[PDB]
Amino acid sequence: PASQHFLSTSVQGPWERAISPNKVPYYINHETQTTCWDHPKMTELYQSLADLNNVRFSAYRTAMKLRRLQKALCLDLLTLSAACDALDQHNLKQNDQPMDILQIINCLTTVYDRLEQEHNNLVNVPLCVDMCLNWLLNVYDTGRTGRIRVLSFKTGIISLCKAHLEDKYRYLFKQVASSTGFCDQRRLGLLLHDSIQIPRQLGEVASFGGSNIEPSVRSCFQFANNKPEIEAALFLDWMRLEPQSMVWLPVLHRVAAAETAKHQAKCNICKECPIIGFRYRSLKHFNYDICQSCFFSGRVAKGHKMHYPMVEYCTPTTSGEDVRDFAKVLKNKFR
Amino acid sequence: PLLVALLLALLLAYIMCCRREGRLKRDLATSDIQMVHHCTIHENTEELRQMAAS
């Protein structure tokens, strides 16, 4: 294409942009044998992302960027039921079934037709199909072979859809467990590998233990009391234990919920009242409430302490609960 | 009533002495790079409405 020479200079060094038979451009990381795509709309999206390197912590960064992507991709308009019906309509039930470009295109069309019928003024089917194919083959097509697995695509869509966190957990467990509902080390490892293929695409894989899924499986099966197989309830409990390699999805759910939160409080640095979004309350001092705008920059008022405990309200508070925790912090400061 | 008036004066002392509080001095201690963050974290926060529009 004529845009190859024009936009090959948008990135430099080892990155090597190449075109695909489906006329979608993609970069090449040749010695890692890993490849990623970059559409011009996703190019400007990533350029906007690159200015948002101000997040101090890891999980917050991943959740905020993934929320920005999901809202930009308009895949937050997709529910669990529509995606499940679309995947069951194309008979993509075997997790190890090879998937060509055409089957993914058909399933994406099935999803996005319903999405546009619900969001005529918000969803454009061909552009959204191109964007979602771009992202999915970014995550799970690093080899440029045109073949992916049904399980990885299912995991990506279910994680990036609009549904309850435990509902997505249960569906993914059913996808990876057998007909008896049992999951051994290998299926859990495959699911964790598919999950860890996501942060490496953006560049925050090492902060959560790297790409080594073995410690995660070891922790999960140690919580399983060394059981040969794990169950859905034990999987949910271990997930609520907030492991290192999976906390990003509940952090995403929280930030999505708190995006519409409005707290009647004042920021104890930038004096912003009312607090909109995330409210953070210190568990040591009194009358100290900070907004996430100053929290993410790392600026601290009155300095930190030997220990500086913090609670993170993501929803408008209940007066009973905050009076209880105020009584707790008075009790703590009394001692 | 003298004790009562003394307590009322004690109330008025911090009622008027506080005079709200400043924010520019906290900006002064804030690094200008952190102030650059303050714009960006507010830019996407104020873009929440344009998240719904888009």
């Binding site: 004042k266 930038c270 004096k271 912003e272 009242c273 | 009533p1 009562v4 008036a5 009322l8 109330l11 008025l12 009622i15 008027m16 709200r20 924010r23 900006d27 303050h38 714009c39 507010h42």
Partner: peptide, 29 residues
């Protein structure tokens, strides 16, 4: 990029009024 608005002088004048009425009525009692 600093925009916060809460009526503060109205709060001080309200506290002033509450204070003076407290003084006056306790004196009356």
């Amino acid at each position: 990029v600093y925009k916060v608005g809460i009526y503060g002088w109205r709060k001080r004048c309200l506290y002033f009024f509450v204070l003076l009425l407290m003084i006056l009525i306790l004196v009356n009692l």
